[PDB]
Amino acid sequence: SKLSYTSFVQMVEDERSVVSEVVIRDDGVLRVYTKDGRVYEVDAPWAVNDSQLIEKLVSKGIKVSGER
């Protein structure tokens, strides 16, 4: 399902965050997996080198995986 960048950040920040995995594709799309078994596509080429976002995901224990 298409998911906006804002809504993606909203999901990450949720105190009961449902985000299990973020796959950072080399084409600038993030595939975002939830603990309830959904997957979303976020078109966000700016995110792929955003170290602040990445270490935030990691610190939350969200699985971060590159893809090519």
Residues at the contact surface with a second copy, assessed by CB under 8 A: 4-7, 9-10, 13-16, 24, 26, 28, 42-46, 48-52, 54-55, 57-59, 61-68
Q: Give CA separation, 37 vs 18, 24, 42, in Å.
A: 9, 18, 16
Q: Output the smallest distance, CB 39 to a second copy, in A.
A: 16
CB of 18 to a second copy, least distance (A): 11
CB of 32 to a second copy, least distance (A): 13
**Among candidate residues 31, 35, 41, the one with its CA nearest the CA of residue 4:** 41
> What whole-number distance in Å separates Cα of residue 43 and Cα of residue 25?
10
Residue nearer to a second copy on the CB measure, 39 or 45? 45
